[PDB]
Amino acid sequence: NVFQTRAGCLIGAEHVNNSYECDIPIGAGICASYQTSQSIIAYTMSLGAENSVAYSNNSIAIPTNFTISVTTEILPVSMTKTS
């Protein structure tokens, strides 16, 4: 089962006209994922989900309620010293 891509000749993954989040990055937007029996697929990555803000010159949306989220952020500091 062969498919031609932008990035080259792909083999053993069924093309999918649907477009989902990029999962295993390949090249030029082609991104593969395992799920449907099952077979590796290849599809044009959807960048993001789509939204269109509902906008009019008098229209404002003010949040009535909030969350407090704790997002871990991780950074190196030092590396193993050697001589």
């Binding site: 509902a54 010159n57 008098n58 229209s59 404002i60 949306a61 003010i62 949040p63 009535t64 309620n65 909030f66 969350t67 407090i68 989220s69 704790v70 997002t71 871990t72 952020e73 991780i74 950074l75 190196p76 500091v77 030092s78 590396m79 193993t80 050697t82």
Partner: protein, 206 residues
């Protein structure tokens, strides 16, 4: 296992190049063997002086490869360490007005946590949630003066004009303490017709 990938990678890449540095002791480099002495005891030294070059020339290079790596990799950590000092300084010891420097949402505080050869911040960020579509106006005529909010914006749910703070919905009736006067009713684009209640006027009536 993945959230530490940044750290786990750094520890890996060193032991990687450390490994590869070691394996280079087993390579011929063109010389007849990769054991130093086994070249010697096989040949009379005036030949070994030639061979041991191709060992040294090989190994010496393999160091300068490994070393020049570390320098580059060191700077990579170096910039990351500078970023950690910046976050440690600004995020934890301050409150960062910078946006998405401390993570998505408006930032409240961070709690650092040590990790092997690294640091882990817990960013406590304030994310709004539930929204309600509001008709708004940038201004409000009263007597022909214009009234603008000191902080926040004039909104209404469709009848009563409320001024509220921006990042949370907290409607309040519109009085002079909410609004300051500037200009008049011609210029503003979008000003509406309303009545700004006065704290003082009732206080008089007795």
């Amino acid at each position: 296992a993945s959230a530490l990938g940044k750290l786990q990678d750094v520890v890996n890449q060193n032991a990687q190049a450390l490994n590869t540095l070691v394996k280079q002791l087993s390579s011929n480099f063109g010389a007849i063997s990769s054991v130093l002495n086994d070249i010697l005891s096989r040949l009379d030294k005036v030949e070994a002086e030639v061979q041991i070059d191709r060992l040294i020339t090989g190994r010496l290079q393999s160091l300068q490869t490994y070393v020049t790596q570390q320098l580059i990799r060191a700077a990579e950590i170096r910039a990351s360490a500078n970023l950690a000092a910046t976050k440690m300084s600004e995020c934890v010891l301050g409150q960062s007005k910078r946006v998405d420097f401390c993570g998505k949402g408006y930032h409240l505080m961070s709690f650092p946590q040590s990790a092997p050869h690294g640091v882990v911040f817990l960013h406590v960020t304030y994310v709004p949630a539930q929204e309600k579509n509001f008709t708004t106006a940038p201004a409000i005529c009263h007597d022909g003066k214009a009234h603008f909010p000191r902080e926040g914006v004039f909104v209404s749910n469709g009848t009563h004009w409320f001024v509220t703070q921006r990042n949370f919905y907290e409607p309040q009736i519109i009085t002079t303490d909410n609004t300051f006067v500037s200009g008049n009713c011609d210029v503003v684009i979008g000003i509406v017709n309303n009545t700004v209640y006065d704290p003082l006027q009732p206080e008089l009536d007795s």
